[PDB]
Symmetry: C3
Subunit: 160 residues, 3 copies
């Protein structure tokens, strides 16, 4: 693991705040608590995000994965990984890491990005019957996206 001082700075700034950040053994990997945006079927949901910062950060974007289950066209259902193409449309070397959590993810949950879906089934349901899809979402969220399920989705070695 190499001495990237931009990665170190941004990790420390994220931790030195009111955000709920659970560390690994390195600044390259950590877990961040995330709340679904108000006014969406995700609004009552809590998720744990697996965030990784690459060795050439911030020239390469962070990777983001939902640890507990989420249903979203741009998110792989099994792994939780957020589509790399969608992240790269927003990310630049000047982009503020905080805005991933404050702007990018909430906006993404408000309506998907038109990028080729990682969850094809969610894309199909959204376009066929949005009202029914939203009801399906709310139910899924109430069961999978509790604060408790988010907490237990942190790997045991780093779970409080």
């Amino acid at each position: 693991l190499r001495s990237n001082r931009r990665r170190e700075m941004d990790y420390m700034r994220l931790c030195n705040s009111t955000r709920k950040v659970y560390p690994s053994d390195t600044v390259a990997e950590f877990w961040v608590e995330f709340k679904g945006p108000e006014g969406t079927p995700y609004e009552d949901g809590t998720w744990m995000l697996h965030v990784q910062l690459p060795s050439d950060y911030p020239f390469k974007s962070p990777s983001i994965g939902f640890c507990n289950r989420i249903l979203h066209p741009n998110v792989d259902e099994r792994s939780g990984s957020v589509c790399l193409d969608v992240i790269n449309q927003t990310w630049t070397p000047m982009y503020q890491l905080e805005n991933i959590f404050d702007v990018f993810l909430p906006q993404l949950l408000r309506y998907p990005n038109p990028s080729d879906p990682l969850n094809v089934q969610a894309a199909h349901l959204l376009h066929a019957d949005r009202v029914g899809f939203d009801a399906l979402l709310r139910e899924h969220v109430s069961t999978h996206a509790t604060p408790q399920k988010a907490l237990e989705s942190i790997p045991e070695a780093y779970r409080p």
Copy 2:
């Protein structure tokens, strides 16, 4: 079809913002409150927002439906100066920031672009204090929540 226009419209609607739809994603009305600490602070306006076919490479157009006095806003039509919008707009710009950042900042103090309301520009530079009083009065009569709601075309106004 313009998938980016669709996306940004839907994200605006799927929020706590007060957005009143037309029959298409290309046109809609948004409630807007004047920024605190300005003569506009007690005002409510309805914004006529249009998203062009080549959005977001071409910027949205923005119009105040109920009356506002501002150097960069055409008094009769309510249209916000296109040159002023283009100084801020880029294909990467977030549509929400038009309402959250661009418009509030604009109302805090005008952009030095050739004014659409030349009277407002001259009053502002001759006597700022008197102009601010003139604004507060105009705002208290024309920028009520009621006047904002009524300025939505009848076909799309909540009944």
Copy 3:
């Protein structure tokens, strides 16, 4: 003369921010609160902000009038490292973000630029927990709302 500087000064003043004017748009004082979740969180400072004649092509200068301990700030003069400001500043940068984003983020963790305060850099590296305790105590004595107010030059102090 400089219409952009005039515009950005007026927008800063026409808000809920606490801005204390000088005799010109080129120089003024802004109240600043330390960011929550840091050893600076209970702090209030007065910032000496100067907008140059070639603004916004040249960045503003920022000085902490009442004392702060931070690797990227010279305590004696108060001045925020010019190199750090220039990493963020561009002619399209919004002045409000200096106060809302740039300074709060800087206080959460220093920029790796050669420190103006070498003492603070050494303390942070050697023992972060002890340094954060040192910070909290310093802040409680030097960064009160009263000390921030008194640090404005008497000619422009309310």
